[model samples]
Target: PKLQAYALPESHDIPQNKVDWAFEPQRAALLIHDMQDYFVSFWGENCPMMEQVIANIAALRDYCKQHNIPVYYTAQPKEQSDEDRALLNDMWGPGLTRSPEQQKVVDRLTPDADDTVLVKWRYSAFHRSPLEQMLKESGRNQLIITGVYAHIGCMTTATDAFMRDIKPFMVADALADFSRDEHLMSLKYVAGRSGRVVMTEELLPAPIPASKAALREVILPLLDESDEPFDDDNLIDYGLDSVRMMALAARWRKVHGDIDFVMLAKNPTIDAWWKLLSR
Candidate 1:
């Protein structure tokens, strides 16, 4: 079968339900699903969506590495016997063990020796894999999911994670599907029912302490005297005006380097604003 043409959807708000959740690095593990040569080959080497997915996953992996978060990968066995593959063989024609190139994980997101690699036989990484035991041993309760075929392995693993009472965060942009509809469908399903759906930007780690301190100094004076941290909350609704924005931008420019007023105006939260400013 021919692989469908792929393109990224415009940044859109994820549909949310009553569950409000956030990721804590101490309790989180980033799972890179099925970015192997056989599966990724469906998209070919030059596919733009594949390239972006690789880049986004690389960013997430690097951030996780820096923050001491564990990284896990799920790949099929390189040499699967008939008994090893079992039902998978009947369904998918013995899986991808014939060629070393087809069985290898893509280079961009290769797993380090410290990283856990689970040889999965089924779509859900938890099925017949040591994923659960590994997570329990590592003391992680949250899964930050990323990789290929959004509606398949990614979605199934997310649902399975939720079933096991683990918080799953499906990184929408860091995953790819055969088409945009399939990708969006998985996001909607995961966000609405299975787990929290988040963009790569939302999953990015906090900025440097000095940059954060400077940002707080600028935004704090403008806030309406709240003890609560409003880093993720909108500042515009809390009395941020054009003058205050200019002042904030000017202060950041003086202390830091260049500041983009337009980007700040667009993302009117300390977290979002700092992502741009720190860059």
Candidate 2:
């Protein structure tokens, strides 16, 4: 099916609301919502904005996979009869037809074996899907959300997550919509109360400058107060559990971005981590 040329409004720049929080990758999951052909095809194959949106989401998804972070997806039911998609039909006209090709996720953002695809019956993925159960079982308390119609599905899901006490990070550039205003408005709404709004660059872990002493100051508290400073000792010996390591890493990312939790567990020493951070 041929698509209409998507339009954008002037001034799409959205300012993020400041919240004193950090995302722990170990306790987070990535949610790719409604990227299926039926929704995505509206952007047309030649759209440059859609291309960038897909690329940003793909990069974030790949990084999550490498970091052992679970990825989840939300797609509307492939074949929705008039009765099944009653509200959707009433509002937006009958959603995705029975056509198999149209129901498939876009090629660049298709789910893999490790990813969980939740068949959504509503805009909010949490509604009628295994989303809550899956997160509970996986021990994930944070969600990084990306996909279409930023003001609709993405907005609702982020609000739902906030209500459920889950930290939701809405990626600004990873979502696409019919116009720039719709997209920017969603970010504004989410930033105000629903959840945190972050760009793809902000979400992805990267290298940053920090001294060995500074790194120790951040991690030492997680170990113990009374314990003497030992740059050469194994941190685990000082009671560094997986949870503590992740917490430390989360804080470190606020300053030095690319400090992996597993890497910290492996090195377990200020000197080793300092060297890794330097390079």
Q: Identify the candidate with maximal lDDT.
A: 1
For 212-246, candidate 2 gives per-residue lDDT tens digits of: 77777766767754775588888777766667778
Off by over 4 Å in 2: 1-12, 207-279
Give the Cα-based TM-score of candidate 1 against the true structure: 0.74
Per-residue lDDT of 20-87 in model 1, one digit per residue for the tens? 68778899999999889898887666887788889999999998999999999999888887877787
What are the RMSDs of all candidates, in order?
Answer: 8.2, 8.2
Per-candidate clashes come to 0, 0
Query: Which segments of model 1 are wrong by more than 4 Å?
Result: 206-279
Candidate 2 all-Cα RMSD: 8.2
- TM-score per prediction, in order, is 0.74, 0.70
